[PDB]
Amino acid sequence: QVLVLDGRGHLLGRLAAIVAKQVLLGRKVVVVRCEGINISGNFYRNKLKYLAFLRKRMNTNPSRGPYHFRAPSRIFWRTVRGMLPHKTKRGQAALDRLKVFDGIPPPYDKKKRMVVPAALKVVRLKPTRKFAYLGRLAHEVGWKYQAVTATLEEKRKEKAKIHYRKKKQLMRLRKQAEKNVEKKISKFTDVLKTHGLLV
Amino acid sequence: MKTILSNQTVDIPENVDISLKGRTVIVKGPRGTLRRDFNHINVELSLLGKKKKRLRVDKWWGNRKELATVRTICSHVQNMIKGVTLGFRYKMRSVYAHFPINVVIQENGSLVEIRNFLGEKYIRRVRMRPGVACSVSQAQKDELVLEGNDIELVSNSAALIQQATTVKNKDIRKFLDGIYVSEKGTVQQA
Amino acid sequence: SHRKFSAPRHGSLGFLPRKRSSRHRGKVKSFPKDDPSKPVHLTAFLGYKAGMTHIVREVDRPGSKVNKKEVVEAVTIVETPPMVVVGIVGYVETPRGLRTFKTVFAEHISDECKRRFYKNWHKSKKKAFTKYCKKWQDDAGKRQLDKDFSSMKKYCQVIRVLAHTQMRLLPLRQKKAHLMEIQVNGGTVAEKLDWARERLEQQVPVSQVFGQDEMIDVIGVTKGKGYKGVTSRWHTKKLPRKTHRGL
Amino acid sequence: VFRRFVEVGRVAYVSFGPHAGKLVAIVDVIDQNRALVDGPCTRVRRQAMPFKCMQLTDFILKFPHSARQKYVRKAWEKADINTKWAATRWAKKIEARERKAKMTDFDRYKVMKAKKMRNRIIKNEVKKLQRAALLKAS
Amino acid sequence: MKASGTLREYKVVGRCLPTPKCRTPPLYRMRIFAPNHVVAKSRFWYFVSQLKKMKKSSGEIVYCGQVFEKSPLRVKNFGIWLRYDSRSGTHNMYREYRDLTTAGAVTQCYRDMGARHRARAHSIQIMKVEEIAASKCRRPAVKQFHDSKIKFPLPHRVLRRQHKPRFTTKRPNTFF
Amino acid sequence: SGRLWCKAIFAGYKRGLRNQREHTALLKIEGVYARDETEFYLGKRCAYVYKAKNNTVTPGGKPNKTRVIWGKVTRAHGNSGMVRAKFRSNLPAKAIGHRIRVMLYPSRI
RNA sequence: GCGCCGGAGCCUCGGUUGGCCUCGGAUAGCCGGUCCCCCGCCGGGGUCCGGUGCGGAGAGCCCUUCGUCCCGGGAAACGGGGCGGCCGGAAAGGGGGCCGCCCUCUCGCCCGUCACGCACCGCACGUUCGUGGGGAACCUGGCGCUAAACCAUUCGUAGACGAC
RNA sequence: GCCACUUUUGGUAAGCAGAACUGGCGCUGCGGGAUGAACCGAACGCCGGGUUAAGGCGCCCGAUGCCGACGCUCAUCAGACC
RNA sequence: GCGGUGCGCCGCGACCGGCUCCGGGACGGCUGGGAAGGCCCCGGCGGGGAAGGUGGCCCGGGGGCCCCGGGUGUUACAGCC
Ligand SMILES: [Mg+2]
Ligand SMILES: [Mg+2]
Ligand SMILES: [Mg+2]
Ligand SMILES: [Mg+2]
Ligand SMILES: [Mg+2]
Ligand SMILES: [Mg+2]
Ligand SMILES: [Mg+2]
Ligand SMILES: [Mg+2]
Ligand SMILES: [Mg+2]
Ligand SMILES: [Mg+2]
Ligand SMILES: [Mg+2]
């Protein structure tokens, strides 16, 4: 009863638009690997937009001003907060439901992370428009932890490769087993084929 | 308009054998192997003929600024096959007015120390990007010969040393000093 | 309207929360970045200020007007007894920073260092690490320790060794010793923990850490001067004599 | 590299629209994005059809680009498409989708009671193959 | 006029009133294009006011009917002569479309003028729509379809039906 | 011995931008997302089930803490399969984004 | 008087009504095998063979709850349930796999046979996660523990007072 | 007294001053124009059901989560509704 | 038993009427007494036309008789008007 969304290949505010309404309707949504979120438009326009957000600062005491978060997780958290009614109790309950991480931490490396096709770069951009990675933008604007995230990601992609070879060889044992037992399951198989489950 | 189809082919000689792995192309031949990754250009690359003699690049439904890119792949692959089967050689001449420009070549072709340019004491160390070898020529007074496979690496390493020898704060039209690219061309003639 | 005569700004905004320091001894905000091609060495030490003195030395800088002449120079004597190493701390690099992994203390911790764990050494019964130092003289405790050393060898990235001053040898009033994490910079993590657990529980002098004529950085809180005003603190220009509510 | 091409005389399964679920034969190309089309042996009347609703398949039957519905019907049932489609593994999984959508309550129960043992037998055969691989290893 | 929906072609005829100097006037006829016969009769009196000395009151409609397309199953080329008013000065034009029906190509004409030139349907003034054979065409965007062996793939099939699987785990495919 | 109610979420009241009308709940039912598809649920008894502090009765049983506010599903809403319900006492805004059960039993099948 | 494991019930806060245990990723390209072939610490790739509106399908997969009783068929047998060791986990560490024992069953599953179980007399919050989270007192045992903080005094590296 | 369509006088001009016609505000809520005396819609007893106007329908925020239709458009200062 | 009135509280159903938002059938009129299309050229007889030119013919190359281009031209072993 928790939506584990992936973040790679998704447009920033176009993912945040679905996430905002889906959290106001009561889900607990965990958008994971947020540094792989990309934004449309080219990287120099996008970092000029974020540097303009940096210079927008309370003049007399910038401690009270806009907290320009630098990590990609909290950039995406700030844009979901912009799309939620967060001055009030239901918007604050929604922000309490949304959890947002950089990379894939170990409550969620073992779980199967979802996608949103409606907010995805190969669906909602022309293939010749330039885009901009939010992780690289965050690193250019002052996020400190790109390199440690990338090394932890190559570690988890190795360990996921191990899990995937194990799952492949289990699936191949399953197909050799079904080939070896079709003589005494082909009566059970045949009524799953007449109801459209194996054709 | 959105033009329905535009294509060009690339004739391929016999001593070489291109192979395309999806959209990145890998040219192997006499001198060395080199690749280039066309995954930014959104076209189709057929490899046709047996002996694989032709590379067809075609683009379907392309407007003007994208049909511009349908023969620039042909130009990159033509320059690619040229640099594989023949290699590239840029000879660049060292022009001075009074102070002679002293060039020494360290790390067997990979770093260039330029000295005495305009009488400056700041010595210039320029590193060739990999695969390019700089060399002082013979039977000619002031040359630097840049050998390599592909022109982007070779001509980039040439432009680095040309912009390294530059005149600042004075009249660039009178003070015609520096090392300038004179003779682009080939290692082995065909 | 603007300011008639431009003039640079009093004070620095870089040091801006000009409050009392939240800690008495100066903390190293950043140790030097390690490279594994060094031998293993300590990147900090901890001495106490004593005073000031002249010297006379013959300066060798060629070209200068004081070449081969003899300047005098103010020096500062930092009395610096050998610190005793007591524990090691390991750190794992996380996408939220660098968290601590597993602090490991030695068996015999001297009462110099034991006073640091107590706000009141008189009223207590001096009970710190009594349940902990039974983990060194039994087999289950020793191989639990070898388990966490093996976990520190493979999950930690930065290793900081714990060291305290040796306060008996100092003429001060106090006895409660200063404890400090010193980062061990040097070779790979196996070499680093082997060095650290071999030199665990024993001393290290200054000459293991620094050398003669080595530029260092000095960290500490300044000399406190109390609640003071803008002329005394920010060095603004005093308003003239005729001012009604104070100048 | 592309292997399904819009041209004169391909059949295309239709995704949505008025005529969802049928094959058509593309006759001519009106625009960048619209095509004159006719499925004459499946009751799709000769009409225009956009490309966005039609999924072109690997059946090229030849006829001229202005041929009438008579000649498209002739080439259709000369090639005998309507059995090649019903034997194609596209339409087999289409009609399988349609079957498990058409499934009633009682046979949903019968499917469940079947597939429970149909998974039990594979599951213990798979674990005995796992221990047979471990005995091969040992 | 609002170019609402696909247009229809209206053959509409009209004449001045029976007046005692000429008791039977001539009858005039227009091919006009309009969403329905009400706005069609209004466009008729607009153009006949532009051409003759004839108005809503000094004349009458006679037959306002539809021209059905006479071969809607043969793809044809249409040449369309226009007259539109820009932000600065009006211009005569010639555009070419390719469609099954005549009113379909004029619907495509109004939408193409509104797309490219921002010309709105009160400003756009039609004058001549003709079916043009496949060699008299002047425009490359139409002439590129004159191929008996025309052939092209459908390269980048961008995923429509985005929100039926809204939280999926498949990455979508676009090579079909 | 399992669930006999469809899952629905009290999205909000029937409202405008500067006005809400609390007599009509907006219910978002799981799985149905079009007006072509919302037709099955019209007229179904829906219920907001909640617990409380002190015990109240429970018919066909003994008193416990749980409580209801019954209703019915009146008419579709929008194009995304959102629907309107009317409850016999208006729902508290406590219930925003909490599970309203929507039953099956006024069947028309 | 406090932590730990080894039963009855009582207040209070409430949400919830089966799980999905994971390749990386491409998008003018993918997925899965054999490896016949070549090297590296099983993997990397060429080659061939299948799928590709994805069926090794999230349009999906697993689980499938009325219960027991007789006996029969298919299924299992090398299986189910019930004590000690081996390791696998660090980014915010997994109620996981594996070697034996002494126990005990042909019961679990799929088709049939046989009857029985308040059939509470048409009627709503049922069915769970649930030994839920927190709070007091009744508990019967066992191995473990019997500390600091603050004031007051002093210091003066600190100081308006606290603070240090 | 003030504002607005259109006509109009002085003034370079003005959220300036001075007129004509009509409608408004003042005396007036309500939906929309984010915000707002005058603009767009619409004028009011207290309610239930239905339906609209002007304006909208990614999310804040009811409504496009249409497999909407045809194009133009790259902005290192994009554009976005009397 | 009949007639009136009400149930202590919480609920359900049934039909009848009013007002509505929908959904499924079915029948007919008008038009250019609809425009097209369907089946009986490879609808019938004969006459033409040209191309987004099919056969064939030639030229060119990719092959193992097919495909790909370019030219000629008028039904041929496709069709269109
Ligand atoms: Mg000068
Ligand atoms: Mg100034
Ligand atoms: Mg005075
Ligand atoms: Mg409950
Ligand atoms: Mg005025
Ligand atoms: Mg009035
Ligand atoms: Mg008013
Ligand atoms: Mg505004
Ligand atoms: Mg008006
Ligand atoms: Mg109302
Ligand atoms: Mg709005």
Residue D74 CA, nucleotide I9 C1', distance (Å): 79
Residue whose structure tokens are 């001067």: C225
Q: Mind telling me how many Å the CA of E169 is from chain A's nearest CA?
A: 5
Q: Whole-angstrom Cα distance, residue C162 to residue C151?
A: 18
Largest Cα separation within chain D, whole Å, is: 72
**For the residues of F71-84, what is the DSSP string, one character each?**
EEEEEEETTTTEEE
Q: Which of B171, B150, B163, B156 is nearest to B36 (CA)?
A: B150
Q: Whole-angstrom Cα distance, residue D8 to residue D65?
A: 6
Q: Whole-angstrom Cα distance, residue C182 to residue C91?
A: 13
CB-nearest to B1 from E141, E150, E152 is E141
How far, in Å, are C102, C198, C205, C216 from residue C85 at the CA level?
A: 17, 10, 10, 21
How far, in Å, are B158, F56, F65 from residue F52 at the CA level?
A: 82, 9, 5
Tell me if chain A has a CB within 8 Å of the CB of E159: yes
The C-alpha angle with vertex B99 and arms to B93 and B101, in degrees rounded to 5, equals: 35
F81 burial via Cβ count (<10 Å: 0-12, 13-18, 19+): buried
Element (H, E) at E8: strand E8-16
How far, in Å, are C47, C85, C166, C205, E36 from residue C170 at the CA level?
A: 11, 18, 8, 15, 106
Q: Which of B23, B93, B102 is nearest to B58 (CA)?
A: B23
C-alpha torsion C165→C169→C172→C176, nearest 10: 40
* Alpha helix segments (H runs only) across chain C: 111-114, 139-155, 189-198, 230-233
Chain E contact set for D64 (CB, 8 A): 148
Q: Whole-angstrom Cα distance, residue B80 to residue B78?
A: 5
- For chain C, list residues whose CB is within 8 angstroms of any CB belonging to chain A: 93-97
How many residues are there in chain B?
A: 190
Phi, psi (deg, nearest 5) at residue B141 = -70, -60
Q: Nearest nucleotide, C1' to the C-alpha of A105?
A: G91
Q: Nearest nucleotide, C1' to the C-alpha of B54?
A: I62
CA–chain centroid gap for E25, Å, is 30
- Contact (CB, 8 A) for F86 and A79: no
CB-nearest to D32 from B2, B44, B45 is B2
Q: Whole-angstrom Cα distance, residue A14 to residue C206?
A: 60
Q: Which of E42, E121, E137, E39 is nearest to E80 (CA)?
A: E137
Q: Whole-angstrom Cα distance, residue D28 to residue D34?
A: 9
- Contact (CB, 8 A) for C72 and C54: yes
Q: Is A32 left (phi over 0), alpha (psi -120 to 50) or beta?
A: beta
Largest Cα separation within chain C, whole Å, is: 83
What is the F19 CA–ligand 7 centroid distance (Å)? 20
Q: Mind telling me how many Å the CA of B80 is from chain D's nearest CA?
A: 22
* Resolution in units of Å: 3.4
Q: Whole-angstrom Cα distance, residue C187 to residue C192?
A: 6
The β-bridge partners of D26 are: D37
Tell me if chain D has a CB within 8 Å of the CB of B61: yes
CB-nearest to E167 from A3, A122, A123 is A3
How far, in Å, are A55, C1, C2, C174, E38 from residue A59 at the CA level?
A: 10, 19, 18, 46, 64
Q: Nearest nucleotide, C1' to the C-alpha of E161?
A: H67
- Contact (CB, 8 A) for E28 and E15: yes
Method: cryo-EM
Q: Whole-angstrom Cα distance, residue B25 to residue B38?
A: 7
Q: Do B44 and D1 touch (CB under 8 A)?
A: yes
C15, two tokens:
């040091």
Q: Do D6 and E160 touch (CB under 8 A)?
A: no
Parallel, antiparallel or unpaired: strands B88-95 and C75-79 = unpaired
How far, in Å, are A178, C23, C84, C209 from residue C87 at the CA level?
A: 60, 21, 10, 17
Handedness of CA A72, A73, A76, A82 (dihedral sign): negative
Q: Nearest nucleotide, C1' to the C-alpha of C121?
A: G148
How many residues are there in chain D?
A: 138
- As a whole number of Å, the end-to-end CA separation of chain A is 32
D87 secondary structure, DSSP code: H
Q: How many CB atoms lie within 10 A of CB B80?
A: 25
Tell me if chain A has a CB within 8 Å of the CB of E157: no
Q: Whole-angstrom Cα distance, residue E169 to residue A4?
A: 10
C32 secondary structure, DSSP code: P
How far, in Å, are A111, A132, A163, C193, E161 from residue A114 at the CA level?
A: 10, 22, 18, 42, 17
Strand boundaries in B13-169, DSSP class E: 17-21, 24-28, 34-36, 44-48, 54-62, 88-95, 102-106, 111-115, 124-127, 133-135, 143-148
Tell me if chain A has a CB within 8 Å of the CB of D98: yes
Q: Which of D88, D111, D104, D84 is nearest to A194 (CA)?
A: D111
Chain A, residues 101-140, CB within 8 A of chain B, namely 127-128
Chain B contact set for D2 (CB, 8 A): 44, 60
E82, two tokens:
């226009």
> What is the side-by-side order of every strand in the sheet holding D10-14?
D44-50, D34-39, D23-29, D10-14, D54-60
B158, two tokens:
């040439």
Which residues in range 60-99 of chain E are in contact with strand H, contact meaning CB within 7 A of any of its atoms?
none
The β-bridge partners of C77 are: C51
D–C contact: 3+ Cβ pairs < 8 A: no
E115 burial via Cβ count (<10 Å: 0-12, 13-18, 19+): exposed
- Here the contacts of A120-125 (C-beta below 8 Å, separation 24 or greater) are A120/A9, A120/A10, A120/A11, A120/E171, A120/E172, A121/A9, A121/A10, A121/A11, A121/A38, A121/A40, A122/A9, A122/E172, A122/E174, A123/E158, A123/E159, A123/E162, A123/E172, A124/A11, A124/A14, A125/A11, A125/A40
Chain A contact set for D133 (CB, 8 A): 173
Q: Whole-angstrom Cα distance, residue E98 to residue E105?
A: 7
Q: Whole-angstrom Cα distance, residue A160 to residue A111?
A: 11
- Contact (CB, 8 A) for F67 and F49: yes
SS3 of residue C71 by DSSP:
strand
Parallel, antiparallel or unpaired: strands A99-100 and A29-31 = parallel
Q: Do E154 and D65 touch (CB under 8 A)?
A: no
Q: Which of E162, C44, D6 is nearest to A18 (CA)?
A: E162
> What is the side-by-side order of every strand in the sheet holding E90-99?
E90-99, E76-85, E125-132
CA–chain centroid gap for E175, Å, is 36
What is the B176 CA–ligand 1 centroid distance (Å)? 15
- Contact (CB, 8 A) for D48 and D84: no
C-alpha torsion C201→C206→C208→C210, nearest 10: 140
Which residues are CB-neighbours of C133 under 8 A, at least 6 positions away? Answer: C105, C107, C108, C109
B69 secondary structure, DSSP code: G
C53, two tokens:
């003195």
- Here the contacts of D45-50 (C-beta below 8 Å, separation 24 or greater) are D46/E73, D47/E73, D48/E100, D49/D14, D49/D17, D49/D24
Tell me if chain E has a CB within 8 Å of the CB of D20: no
Q: How many CB atoms lie within 10 A of CB B110?
A: 17
Q: Mind telling me how many Å the CA of A78 is from chain F's nearest CA?
A: 22
D–F contact: 3+ Cβ pairs < 8 A: no
D87, two tokens:
């034997």
Using a 7 Å cut-off to protein CB atoms, list the covered nucleotides of chain H: 30-33, 48-50, 58-76, 78
Q: Gaps after which residues in chain E, C–N over 2.5 Å?
A: none
**For the residues of C111-123, what is the DSSP string, one character each?**
HHHHGGG-S-TTT
Q: Which ligand is nearest to the CA of F16?
A: 11
CA atoms within 13 A on the CB side of A156: 15
C37, two tokens:
């091609």
- Contact (CB, 8 A) for D78 and D8: no
Residue whose structure tokens are 């060194």: C136
- Contact (CB, 8 A) for B7 and B70: yes
Q: Whole-angstrom Cα distance, residue B160 to residue B178?
A: 12
- Contact (CB, 8 A) for A129 and A57: no
- Amino acid letter at C124? S
Q: Which of C121, E139, F87 is nearest to B3 (CA)?
A: E139
Residue F19 CA, nucleotide H43 C1', distance (Å): 19
- Here the contacts of E140-144 (C-beta below 8 Å, separation 24 or greater) are E140/B1, E141/B1, E141/B2, E141/E96, E142/E77, E142/E96, E142/E97, E142/E98, E144/B1, E144/B3, E144/B4
Q: Nearest nucleotide, C1' to the C-alpha of D66?
A: I80
Tell me if chain D has a CB within 8 Å of the CB of E74: yes
Residue D125 CA, nucleotide G115 C1', distance (Å): 37
**For the residues of chain A, what is the DSSP string, one character each?**
--EEE--TTBBHHHHHHHHHHHHHTT--EEE--GGG-EEES-HHHHHHHHHHHHH---SS-TTSS-----SHHHHHHHHHHHHS-TTSHHHHHHHHH-EE-SS--TTTSSS--BB-GGGBHHHHS-TTS-EEEHHHHHHHHT-S-HHHHHHHHHHHHHHHHHHHHHHHHHHHHHHHHHHHHHHHHHHHHHHHHHTTS--
D24 secondary structure, DSSP code: E
SS3 of residue E108 by DSSP:
helix
Q: Which of E170, E171, E174 to mutate to test the interface with A (most CBs of A within 10 A)?
A: E171
Q: Nearest nucleotide, C1' to the C-alpha of E164?
A: H65
Which residues in range 85-124 of chain A are in contact with strand H, contact meaning CB within 7 A of any of its atoms?
85, 91
SS3 of residue D116 by DSSP:
helix
How many residues are there in chain C?
A: 247
Chain B residue closest to A130 (CA)? B40
Q: Whole-angstrom Cα distance, residue C243 to residue C239?
A: 7
Phi, psi (deg, nearest 5) at residue B27 = -105, 125
C-alpha torsion A150→A152→A154→A159, nearest 10: -160
Q: Do E152 and B3 touch (CB under 8 A)?
A: no
Q: Which ligand is nearest to the CA of F50?
A: 4
Q: Which ligand is nearest to the CA of F101?
A: 4
Chain A contact set for B42 (CB, 8 A): 127-128
SS3 of residue C173 by DSSP:
coil
Q: Whole-angstrom Cα distance, residue A113 to residue A6?
A: 5
Q: Whole-angstrom Cα distance, residue E160 to residue C182?
A: 60
Using a 7 Å cut-off to protein CB atoms, list the covered nucleotides of chain G: 12-30, 32-34, 42-43, 46, 51-66, 74-79, 89-94, 109-111, 123-127, 147-152, 155-160, 163-164
SS3 of residue B1 by DSSP:
coil
Q: How many CB atoms lie within 10 A of CB A52?
A: 9
